[PDB]
Design an enzyme around this catalytic site. Structure first.
Site, mmCIF file in Angstrom:
data_model
loop_
_atom_site.group_PDB
_atom_site.id
_atom_site.type_symbol
_atom_site.label_atom_id
_atom_site.label_comp_id
_atom_site.label_asym_id
_atom_site.label_seq_id
_atom_site.Cartn_x
_atom_site.Cartn_y
_atom_site.Cartn_z
ATOM 1 N N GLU A 82 0.879 -1.189 0.000
ATOM 2 C CA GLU A 82 0.000 0.000 0.000
ATOM 3 C C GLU A 82 0.906 1.225 0.000
ATOM 4 O OE1 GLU A 82 -3.968 1.730 2.283
ATOM 5 O OE2 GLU A 82 -2.299 0.898 3.507
ATOM 6 N N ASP A 86 9.362 7.307 0.456
ATOM 7 C CA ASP A 86 8.673 8.016 -0.638
ATOM 8 C C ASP A 86 8.420 6.968 -1.738
ATOM 9 O OD1 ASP A 86 8.507 9.544 -2.873
ATOM 10 O OD2 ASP A 86 10.445 10.407 -2.787
ATOM 11 N N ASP A 130 -3.590 11.720 -2.045
ATOM 12 C CA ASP A 130 -3.596 13.203 -2.150
ATOM 13 C C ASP A 130 -4.045 13.599 -3.559
ATOM 14 O OD1 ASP A 130 -2.810 13.205 0.487
ATOM 15 O OD2 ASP A 130 -0.721 13.704 0.134
ATOM 16 N N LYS A 190 -4.975 20.926 -8.871
ATOM 17 C CA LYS A 190 -4.484 21.951 -9.835
ATOM 18 C C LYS A 190 -3.602 21.272 -10.885
ATOM 19 C CE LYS A 190 -4.477 25.906 -6.618
ATOM 20 N NZ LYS A 190 -3.602 26.820 -5.841
ATOM 21 N N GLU A 213 -9.420 4.502 7.148
ATOM 22 C CA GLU A 213 -9.877 5.594 8.055
ATOM 23 C C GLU A 213 -10.803 6.523 7.271
ATOM 24 O OE1 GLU A 213 -8.440 4.997 11.928
ATOM 25 O OE2 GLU A 213 -9.307 6.968 11.521
HETATM 26 C C1 LIG Z 1 -5.393 11.402 2.467
HETATM 27 S S1 LIG Z 1 -4.307 10.199 3.200
HETATM 28 C C2 LIG Z 1 -5.244 8.637 3.101
HETATM 29 C C3 LIG Z 1 -4.762 7.698 4.210
HETATM 30 C C4 LIG Z 1 -5.335 6.276 4.181
HETATM 31 N N1 LIG Z 1 -4.911 5.550 2.958
HETATM 32 C C5 LIG Z 1 -6.869 6.310 4.238
HETATM 33 O O1 LIG Z 1 -7.500 6.170 3.182
HETATM 34 O O2 LIG Z 1 -7.458 6.469 5.314
HETATM 35 C C6 LIG Z 1 -3.115 9.878 1.865
HETATM 36 C C7 LIG Z 1 -1.756 9.466 2.400
HETATM 37 O O3 LIG Z 1 -0.824 9.295 1.308
HETATM 38 C C8 LIG Z 1 0.448 9.628 1.802
HETATM 39 N N2 LIG Z 1 1.350 9.830 0.679
HETATM 40 C C9 LIG Z 1 1.183 10.707 -0.362
HETATM 41 N N3 LIG Z 1 2.162 10.667 -1.232
HETATM 42 C C10 LIG Z 1 3.034 9.711 -0.728
HETATM 43 C C11 LIG Z 1 4.267 9.213 -1.192
HETATM 44 N N4 LIG Z 1 4.861 9.638 -2.305
HETATM 45 N N5 LIG Z 1 4.880 8.264 -0.446
HETATM 46 C C12 LIG Z 1 4.277 7.841 0.671
HETATM 47 N N6 LIG Z 1 3.123 8.234 1.205
HETATM 48 C C13 LIG Z 1 2.543 9.185 0.451
HETATM 49 C C14 LIG Z 1 0.205 10.874 2.642
HETATM 50 O O4 LIG Z 1 1.261 11.192 3.533
HETATM 51 C C15 LIG Z 1 -1.097 10.469 3.347
HETATM 52 O O5 LIG Z 1 -0.849 9.832 4.588
#
Ligand SMILES: C[S@@+](CC[C@H](N)C(=O)[O-])C[C@H]1O[C@@H](n2cnc3c(N)ncnc32)[C@H](O)[C@@H]1O
Ligand SMILES: C[S@@+](CC[C@H](N)C(=O)[O-])C[C@H]1O[C@@H](n2cnc3c(N)ncnc32)[C@H](O)[C@@H]1O
Lengths: 204, 206
Positions: free
Chosen positions: A35, A87, A109, A113, A183
């Site tokens: 994930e 990352d 995320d 934009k 969540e």
């Molecule tokens: C809006 S949260 C959703 C969290 C969880 N998957 C849920 O649905 O409840 C999206 C997550 O993606 C992570 N994330 C975004 N880009 C990432 C990357 N390049 N590497 C690791 N994590 C990343 C963010 O830090 C964030 O915790």
């Protein structure tokens, strides 16, 4: 920082070292499902409990939230889950082609934009990264409640040449066999806002 | 009484469309692109589009003559000269058009045929997709709106399976910034329901 070091069994401090040897870390050759963007870790923990015969790796850029995720993995005693504070671009540093069998993307995320398109985890660059670690025998399992992101993602998948084998435009009113809610999913479910779901795979 | 109404209005409702195969430009008196709609119904959409886009030529096709009568009257009621109507099924499209003659295919709230055994009656099933390719070549697009989640879900998978490229998708059209969207008869009823309207644009890979 230092509660991660204490729970270094669940949270791997040097994931590059196990590139091509993740099976040794788990002590079996059960498929590895990852994930990308685990967050607080409800989804990876549920899936771990539900599927003891699959090995789960969660990746999360923030230590602040990956902490909550190790606690949830420690709380449910699932031995088939590890967590990486890395990352998505370092995925190729951590996995050899075919070592990963499936990639999960959960409420990523949106970066709505135009100028921020390349930050979206469904952008072609990240698609290439998932290909590198799965070869072409992989799939991506994606759910989000963000309309803009899903519609972008569908176009992205299509543009890259992936095959759409599952799509729900209202997941909660579709027959799910054992869909573990994230969540985010639990909050938005109450709203009546639809949860979007896609499965795409590489074309043989 | 439909057949006789169609006979008096044969200028709008072409009785022998096969005869104009490769010569549809002569019927219109210009080389403006021809866009077609498969499953016109009462003809609100094609009348609106005709009136909005005088530089596009529109051909509606409808199997039912019962409803294509209403469509002729709407085309007659709005003096749009850039619209003709054919009482033919989608299978006959190749008998009527040469490859590239059609520039665009509109599909609007098509029959969903939800049961698995009826997949082949769906206007987004691979056989019909092959027909649209034959009449557009591979520089065409398909513009598709529906309220039916099942059919849209199926259609996305069908487009993908056939190798088409998705270039536009809305999962809530009425809350999306659409410039000059012409509502169909069916669309206007569903607009007031909070029910989302699904739209895709799909084109051939070059
Ligand atoms: C809006 S949260 C959703 C969290 C969880 N998957 C849920 O649905 O409840 C999206 C997550 O993606 C992570 N994330 C975004 N880009 C990432 C990357 N390049 N590497 C690791 N994590 C990343 C963010 O830090 C964030 O915790
Ligand atoms: C849901 S009904 C009317 C929908 C209308 N276009 C709208 O959106 O308001 C779809 C229409 O397509 C017609 N149709 C179905 N298959 C067709 C085919 N192969 N060729 C032409 N018309 C067809 C049906 O008879 C019906 O009148």
């Amino acid at each position: 920082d230092d509660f991660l070091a204490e729970n270094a069994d669940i949270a791997i401090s040097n994931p590059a070292d196990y590139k091509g040897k993740w099976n040794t870390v788990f002590g079996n050759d059960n498929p590895i499902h990852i994930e990308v963007g685990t967050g607080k870790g409800q989804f990876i923990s549920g899936m771990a409990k539900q599927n003891p015969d699959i090995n789960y790796i969660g990746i999360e850029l923030f230590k602040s939230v990956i902490v909550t995720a190790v606690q949830k993995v420690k709380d449910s005693e699932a031995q088939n889950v590890k967590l990486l504070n890395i990352d998505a671009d370092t995925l190729t540093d951590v996995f050899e082609p075919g070592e990963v069998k499936r990639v999960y993307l959960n409420f990523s995320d949106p970066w709505p934009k135009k100028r921020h398109e390349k930050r979206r985890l469904t952008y072609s660059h990240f698609l290439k990264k998932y290909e590198e670690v799965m070869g072409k025998g992989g799939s991506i399992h994606f759910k989000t409640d963000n309309r803009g992101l899903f519609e972008y993602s569908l176009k992205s998948f299509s543009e890259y040449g992936l095959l759409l084998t599952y799509v729900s435009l209202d997941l909660h009113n579709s027959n799910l066999e054992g869909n573990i809610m994230t969540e985010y999913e639990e909050k938005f479910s109450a709203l009546g806002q639809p949860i979007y779901r896609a499965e795409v795979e590489w074309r043989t």
